[PDB]
Write a protein that binds this ligand. Structure first.
Ligand SMILES: CN(c1ccccc1CNc1nc(Nc2ccc3c(c2)CC(=O)N3)ncc1C(F)(F)F)S(C)(=O)=O
Length: 261
């Protein structure tokens, strides 16, 4: 069990949905230093916001995966603190924008592949992620991204990222996560472009009903855009399960390192 004394804040990382996140340091019990990020709860509305905060904590306590943010410990007390590993590189959306020219599609696929395995894992443990989006994904290194911890489950709504069912009947299933995930693949492959930036929220469903979808992205192969295309099938039962995307992407990528002279 870790205690407040073991943590030393240094600055403000930003403002999360629940309140400031702080960069700090955490000394072991062997005496070792570890850069860290500390999730805190605003001036959180009564039960509602804190409960949502706790719910996230509890899930995170349980998860364990190379491509999910590393939870280091929790200070249940007051105010309660969630200590995550820090990833200096920051959000993928921005690392994407500031490295267009440097990044080789074999990398953009590698990212997608690791996000997918993170999802397959989550699916296995009965969890859903309500925020698979490039600004909610962290860059651990150049060859490694780590998914969120926020949207993690089982308002402001990524309508532009949600399946039709997710919109009409607020149904958030693992098949709607398959849809949301493909939208995140698009986002990577399109160097941080915002999905449907031309539309306003209130008209997305309409668009998809007509059968309109996000355009192939420049660097995206055809096998991949086709795979993405199935995840956007209006009929849930039609889209691929994670286990399958992890196989296909696992191919499109080992092929991608083949096509690599
Ligand atoms: C900045 N914020 C943020 C935005 C998107 C995603 C993640 C975070 C902060 N959370 C984490 N942030 C990091 N590293 C990190 C992140 C964002 C930047 C930086 C580092 C440097 C920077 O300039 N932005 N390492 C681990 C986490 C962990 F493990 F908590 F999820 S905020 C404050 O909540 O708005």
């Amino acid at each position: 069990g870790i205690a407040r004394e073991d943590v030393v804040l240094n600055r403000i990382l930003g403002e999360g949905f629940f309140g400031e996140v702080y960069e700090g340091v955490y000394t072991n019990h062997k005496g070792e230093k570890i850069n860290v990020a500390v999730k805190t709860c605003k001036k959180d509305c009564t039960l509602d916001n804190k409960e949502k905060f706790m719910s996230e904590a509890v899930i995170m306590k349980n998860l364990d995966h190379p491509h999910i943010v590393k939870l280091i410990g929790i200070i249940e007390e007051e105010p309660t603190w969630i200590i995550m590993e820090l990833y200096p590189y920051g959000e993928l959306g921005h690392y994407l924008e500031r490295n267009k020219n440097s990044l080789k599609v074999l990398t953009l696929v590698l990212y997608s592949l690791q996000i997918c395995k993170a999802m397959a894992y989550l699916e296995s443990i009965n969890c859903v992620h309500r925020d698979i989006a490039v600004r909610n994904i962290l860059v651990a290194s150049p060859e490694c991204v780590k998914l969120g911890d926020f949207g993690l489950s089982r308002t402001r709504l990524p309508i532009k990222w949600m399946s039709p069912e997710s919109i009409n009947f607020r149904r958030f299933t693992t098949a709607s996560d398959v849809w949301m995930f493909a939208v995140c693949m698009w986002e990577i492959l399109s160097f941080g472009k915002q999905p449907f930036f031309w539309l306003e929220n209130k008209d997305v469903i309409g668009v998809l009903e007509k059968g309109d979808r996000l355009p192939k992205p420049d660097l995206c192969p055809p096998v991949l855009y086709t795979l993405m295309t199935r995840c956007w099938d209006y009929d849930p039962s039609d889209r691929p399960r994670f286990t399958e995307l992890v196989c296909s992407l696992s191919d499109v990528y080992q092929m991608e390192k083949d096509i690599a002279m």
